[PDB]
């Protein structure tokens, strides 16, 4: 256990940042960045002509010395993601009924049907400003995108858990909505 | 302790520590008016304090709940009951001390413009580790059935606007009173001038 713990980030050349009250204000290409991190003890060193962010924790004992690691990889991935959109790789899955999609209202209020033949209404949402839309290459694929790591990630997270059935063995009943890989624009 | 009455802003104050300080003041004989009791903080998770209040709620006289412990879900009443638990309310002197206390949510009419004092020995920022969990008495009361939290907030924002405007007037009054001091000074005789300067006035 020791006193100064910090990482020297390498700020991407395609962004421009600033700091105030543990509220970092950044501008990339797609837009501007801020977030509330007031749950953690965090200080910042910053440069702009010479650049690089340093998020520093003082007297960080190891239980919370991993808050830093989280944010240090997280924000470093944040600017990269907002520059180059983060693209996971999800396949709509079906063993018997090829999935019915009624995508009403411009990527907002997505619908799911043809999943065990209930023929009822179901709809799970996502984040605003994040797209999870059909890939014209294959009908069984919906490409996700976005600018934030969490933006591209909850929009792939909230979906696997939305239309689950009852009284079927997953070892043989292989129904699901899969998410496999991550790529970029 | 030696004032006619002390008005205490309960925002950001830990419930038990605040109650102990208030109870000792009341027992010594100082009248206390506690305002904004819905912003009192309690250490421990909101779910923890929720469980504690449900344990309190399931508690009642089986024969006749009318006689049972009244639960008093308003945050001001919660602070009042906590204070009462820290003084001998069964005695005459303890009852007088209990009645010498007033508790409010928000700031009612005769507390817009008297000074609100703060007990730093009970402030969350000085009594709780930043990485540790705390709750808010207004939220806890709303979870256990107070349902007046939003109205208190909307009244509080109007109070904030009124206070903002009147403080903005007061600072202009104060800086004008300061700039008239400047040439009230150099027109004063040197022997008084020197005394005022060297004694920091």
């Amino acid at each position: 256990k020791t006193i100064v713990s910090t990482q020297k980030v390498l700020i991407p050349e395609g962004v421009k940042v600033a700091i105030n009250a543990r509220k970092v204000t950044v501008s990339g290409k797609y837009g501007t960045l801020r977030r509330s991190f007031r749950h953690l003890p965090i200080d910042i060193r910053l440069n702009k002509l010479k650049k690089y962010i340093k998020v520093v924790m003082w007297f960080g004992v190891p239980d919370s010395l991993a808050c830093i690691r989280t944010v240090c990889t997280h924000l470093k991935n944040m600017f990269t993601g907002v520059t180059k959109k983060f693209l996971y790789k999800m396949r709509l899955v079906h063993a018997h009924f090829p999935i019915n999609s009624n995508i009403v209202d411009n990527n907002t209020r997505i619908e799911i049907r043809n999943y065990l033949g209930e023929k009822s209404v179901r709809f799970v949402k996502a984040l605003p400003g994040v797209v999870i839309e059909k890939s014209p290459n294959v009908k069984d694929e919906i490409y996700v995108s976005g600018a934030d790591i969490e933006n591209v990630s909850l929009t792939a997270a909230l979906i696997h858990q939305s239309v689950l059935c009852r009284n079927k063995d997953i070892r043989k009943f292989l129904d699901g909505i899969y998410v496999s890989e991550v790529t970029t624009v | 302790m030696y004032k006619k009455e002390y008005v205490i802003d309960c925002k950001g104050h830990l419930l038990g520590r605040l109650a102990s300080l208030i109870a000792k003041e009341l027992l010594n004989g100082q009248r206390i008016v506690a305002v904004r009791c819905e912003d009192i903080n309690i250490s421990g998770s909101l779910y923890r304090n929720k469980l504690k209040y449900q344990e309190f709620l399931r508690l009642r006289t089986n024969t006749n709940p009318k006689k049972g412990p009244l639960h008093l879900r308003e945050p001001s009443k919660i602070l009042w009951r906590c204070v009462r638990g820290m003084l001998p309310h069964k005695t005459y002197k303890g009852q007088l001390a209990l009645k010498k206390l007033k508790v409010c949510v928000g700031m009612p009419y005769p507390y817009d413009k008297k000074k609100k004092y703060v007990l730093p020995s009970a402030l969350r920022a000085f009594r709780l580790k930043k990485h540790r969990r705390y709750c808010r008495l207004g939220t806890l009361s709303s979870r256990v059935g107070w349902n007046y939290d939003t109205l208190v907030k909307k009244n509080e924002v109007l109070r904030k606007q009124v206070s903002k405007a009147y403080y903005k007037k007061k600072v202009n009054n104060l800086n004008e009173k300061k700039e008239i001091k400047t040439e009230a000074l150099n027109l004063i005789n040197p022997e008084q001038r020197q005394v005022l300067e060297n004694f920091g006035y």
Partner: protein, 337 residues
């Protein structure tokens, strides 16, 4: 030890204490809620015991065994001696509850309404509402401006007129009826035209909606447990009578719990009846209002032989689902859902 055979408790604990109601009218605890999107209209009405009868109908619920075949139903036809709107009350929200800012009275107040403020009207000087109705319009404009600026709930003080009914009572019944709608700035105009006249129902009361009834049940004085809570009668061999509860509690707690049925007052209770859907609109004078084009006879709301223990009905009619609590001549309050 445990009971050998379980059975649900006698009576409901949600209607305690089973004591006499403090009033005769049916008071409303809660009015229907309001929303921002919705437009501004009326909220409730009132009247006297009007009649809860059948009316022949036909199901259309897909998959019933009756459906196309004729059915008989049960609902109520309601009474409206036109209520007179005489006052306005403004309420504003506070952490201590919803509190009156002020009430404004109409420039001219009836005598039936004035009679309610007295216990011996015949011997009085009839001085009530004599110098408070000649105030200038300036105070009205100076405080109704505050009403919209500070108050969030608006109610109209209305009163019945028993002189249009066979009641012996001459005092009017007084109540307040909320007003519902959306945004406050659309209420100032709408609360400025109907502030003196009497109340025609058809403005809001419309087919295919739900309303509720509230009143005071009949009185039966003191009655035993067998009638108050419907407890099991004891066997005929019982020594000191059989119309009682055998065990009124275990040894411990060494007290009688409040859940034990006991002798006491039954009836003359305060009750609200829910889920009554309104169905039809009608009048008092018109002749083709109650019957239909399938029957085309001649008759209306009018009764026959005289209403036993009531008299004759000469006011408006409608149609609403349900049946109603209370005795004859009892004031009944009609709320919406």
């Amino acid at each position: 030890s445990h009971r050998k055979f379980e059975r649900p408790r006698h009576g409901s604990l949600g209607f305690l204490p089973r004591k006499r109601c403090k009033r005769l009218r049916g008071k409303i605890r809660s009015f229907p809620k309001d929303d921002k999107e919705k437009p501004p209209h009326f909220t409730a009405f009132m009247g006297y015991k009007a009649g809860m009868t059948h009316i022949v109908r036909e199901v259309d619920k897909p998959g019933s065994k009756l459906h196309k075949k004729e059915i008989v139903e049960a609902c109520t036809i309601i009474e409206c001696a036109p209520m007179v709107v005489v006052g306005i009350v403004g309420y504003r929200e506070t952490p201590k509850g919803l509190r009156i800012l002020s009430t404004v009275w109409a420039n001219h107040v009836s005598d039936e309404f004035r009679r309610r403020y007295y216990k011996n009207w015949y011997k009085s000087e009839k001085k009530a509402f004599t110098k408070s109705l000649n105030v200038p319009e300036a105070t009205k404009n100076c405080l109704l401006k505050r009403i919209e600026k500070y108050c969030t709930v608006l109610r109209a003080i209305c009163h019945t007129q028993p002189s249009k009914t066979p009641l012996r009572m001459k005092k009017a019944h007084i109540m307040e009826v909320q007003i519902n709608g959306g945004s406050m700035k659309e209420k100032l105009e709408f609360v400025k035209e109907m502030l003196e006249k009497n109340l025609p129902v058809s403005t809001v009361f419309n087919p295919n909606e739900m309303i509720d009834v509230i009143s005071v049940t009949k009185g039966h004085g003191t009655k035993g447990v067998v009638s108050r809570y419907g407890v099991k009668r004891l066997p005929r061999k019982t020594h000191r009578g059989l119309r009682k509860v055998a065990c009124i509690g275990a040894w411990h707690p060494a007290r009688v719990q409040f859940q034990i049925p006991r002798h006491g007052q039954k009836g003359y209770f305060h009750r609200t009846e829910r889920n009554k859907k309104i169905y039809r609109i009608g009048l008092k004078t018109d002749k083709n209002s109650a019957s239909t084009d399938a029957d085309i006879t001649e008759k209306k709301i009018t009764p026959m032989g005289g209403f036993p223990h009531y008299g004759v009905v000469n006011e408006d009619f409608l149609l609403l689902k349900g049946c109603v609590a209370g005795t004859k001549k009892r004031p009944i309050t009609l709320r919406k859902n």
